[PDB]
Amino acid sequence: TIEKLLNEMQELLTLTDSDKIKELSLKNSGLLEDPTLAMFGNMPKGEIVALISSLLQSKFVKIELKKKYAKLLLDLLGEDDWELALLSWLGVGELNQEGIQKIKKLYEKAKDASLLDWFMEIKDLPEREKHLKVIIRALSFDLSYMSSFEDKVRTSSIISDLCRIIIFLSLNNYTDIIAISIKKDKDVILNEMLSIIEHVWLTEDWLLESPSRVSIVEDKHVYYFHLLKEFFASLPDACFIDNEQRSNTLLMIGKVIDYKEDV
């Protein structure tokens, strides 16, 4: 219903905390007043979306008018996956068809996958952080509506992994590792860090070929492992899949540093 649609729109609006909406006058926009359509014209979708929301989120506006605008926003966005659309248009600054499709793809994927699989999808995206935060909001919204505990497990599990990537992206300690790499790309190093987290069953054999994957300059292969131990020791607990995952990873790097010292 329209009545519950407004509530879902406001519920989605509280998941995002767009300053765009708060900065907005509303008073002097002229939206008051009442039967409205597309008076906005030339105005970009993202801006009409935020402006409508500014009214929906209003502390003084009557619920009768909020309903009229709610239906209108539902026409602007597509009736299918409008929730995701709303979250996208508010969540992303420069939102283009490449982003809309990607976000939609990532979401349908989540609704049927490791932390690298997720990173590799969002890797080359403008405001990739933002694109990812959209899916997180969407999934956490859906979670409160799921019947199946199996769905609940899958859904919450993805939320953890997506937030994990968000934490990984938010860091800049790899500068010294990026320095010693041939390609000098942050993403190639970042990919490797995620692989070590993915490889819960970390083997001495696998870990030993780590500077070869990231193409670390010759001789500087031991130093790499020293920086790696330093890196994993520095990470927040949220980054690890298990409590013993830190302790085991650091043991392994230490075991490898010790093995290389004789050869």
DSSP class per residue in 219-248: TTHHHHHHHHHHHHHHS-GGG-SSSHHHHH
> Which range in 35-43, 49-57, 143-151, 201-209 contacts Br ion by CB under 5 A?
143-151
Minimum distance from CB of 21 to Br ion (Å)?
35
What span, in angstroms and rounded, lies between the C-alpha atoms of 246 and 237?
8
CA distance readout (Å), 77 to 45, 48, 205: 9, 11, 52
Give, as ranges, the residues between 155 and 184 that touch Br ion (CB under 5 A). none
CA 137 to chain centre: 9
What span, in angstroms and rounded, lies between the C-alpha atoms of 226 and 257?
7
Counting contacts by CB under 5 A, is residue 112 touching Br ion?
A: no
- The CA angle 56-60-64, to the nearest 5 degrees, is 60
Counting contacts by CB under 5 A, is residue 64 touching Br ion?
A: no
* Residues 196-235, mask of contacts with Br ion (x by CB under 5 A): ----------------------------------------
Size of the site for Br ion (CB under 5 A): 5
**Closer to Br ion by Cβ: residue 150 or 237:** 150
Counting contacts by CB under 5 A, is residue 109 touching Br ion?
A: no
**Closer to Br ion by Cβ: residue 158 or 216:** 158
What span, in angstroms and rounded, lies between the C-alpha atoms of 217 and 31?
61
Counting contacts by CB under 5 A, is residue 149 touching Br ion?
A: yes
**Closer to Br ion by Cβ: residue 157 or 215:** 157
**Closer to Br ion by Cβ: residue 8 or 151:** 151
What span, in angstroms and rounded, lies between the C-alpha atoms of 239 and 160?
10
DSSP count for the chain of H helices, then E strands: 15, 0
Sole binder of Br ion in the list 67, 68, 104, 154 (CB under 5 A) = 154
Minimum distance from CB of 165 to Br ion (Å)?
18
Sole binder of Br ion in the list 28, 97, 144, 148 (CB under 5 A) = 148
Minimum distance from CB of 112 to Br ion (Å)?
11
Counting contacts by CB under 5 A, is residue 150 touching Br ion?
A: yes
Minimum distance from CB of 19 to Br ion (Å)?
35
What are the start-end ranges of the H helices in 28-81? 45-56, 63-76
What's at 148, amino acid-wise? S
Binding site for Br ion (CB under 5 A): 148-150, 153-154
